[PDB]
Design a protein around this ligand. Structure first.
Ligand SMILES: O=C1Cc2cc(Nc3nc(Cl)ncc3Br)ccc2N1
Ligand SMILES: O=C1Cc2cc(Nc3nc(Cl)ncc3Br)ccc2N1
Ligand SMILES: [Cl-]
Ligand SMILES: [Cl-]
Lengths: 124, 4, 124, 4
């Protein structure tokens, strides 16, 4: 086509979706990770995670307001990944890398799994 | 704005 | 912070939200523009438009499944802008620029209004 | 991935 493109549009959209998340505006699901609860937008979760895409396209699970993750999932690792979904920024640290990688594999977040594998390989 |  | 950032994340999120729109997955509102209807995600509309942000943060309108735009709004101009919201690409043409600019002013989409004003100024 |  003969379209023009606004370079910052995608980043500005995500920044606004994160602002809605911070103010708990139009969040439509609670993700339960053991004793912790995380409110989010189903559409953002699906856009970032192969697991959430599969969950919310299911004819029964699409209507659930609460999703319980596997008990092996670490709430801090989930929190780091939820923040990454809404910001593009990943708080990857020596102390959390194993939990973040395990959570990203479970959530099917391929690019996160890739950088975790590379950061681990560098320290061995 | 750019030509994509 | 000491975060790392994935450059393409925001673009990939928006691409996936557009895929959900194309398959009519988790759309939660119909925007009525005269005889035409447009299905969308309230969160994406709010993230792109000052008017939709104001509408869906209203304690009564947040719960509406149908929103009727002013009868002066052109359905083609709205369609072009809805596509821009989900893609960052704007199909701006000599034949549609007046309708697109009028629709972007109504929707409160400041960057679109700005490029329309500049393209009009160049042709005068 | 980059240093933002
Ligand atoms: O690593 C990742 C990230 C991700 C996101 C989605 N999400 C969607 N995929 C498609 Cl094709 N259409 C709409 C949506 Br929402 C699917 C798989 C994966 N794997
Ligand atoms: O030209 C534009 C585009 C736009 C988008 C929003 N959307 C939001 N703004 C804020 Cl501050 N927080 C969350 C959301 Br969603 C507000 C105003 C405008 N004007
Ligand atoms: Cl990822
Ligand atoms: Cl805009």
């Amino acid at each position: 086509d003969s379209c023009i493109q606004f370079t910052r549009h995608a980043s500005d959209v995500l920044l606004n979706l994160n602002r809605l998340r911070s103010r708990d505006i139009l969040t439509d699901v609670v993700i339960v990770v053991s004793r912790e609860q995380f409110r989010a937008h189903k559409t953002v979760l699906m856009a970032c995670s192969g697991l959430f895409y599969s969950i919310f396209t299911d004819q029964l699970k699409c209507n659930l307001s609460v999703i319980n993750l596997d008990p092996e999932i670490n709430p801090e690792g989930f929190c780091i990944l939820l923040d990454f979904m809404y910001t593009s920024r990943l708080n990857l640290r020596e102390g959390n890398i194993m939990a973040v990688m395990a959570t990203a594999m479970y959530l099917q977040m391929e690019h996160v799994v890739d950088t975790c594998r590379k950061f681990i390989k560098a320290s061995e | 704005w750019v030509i994509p």
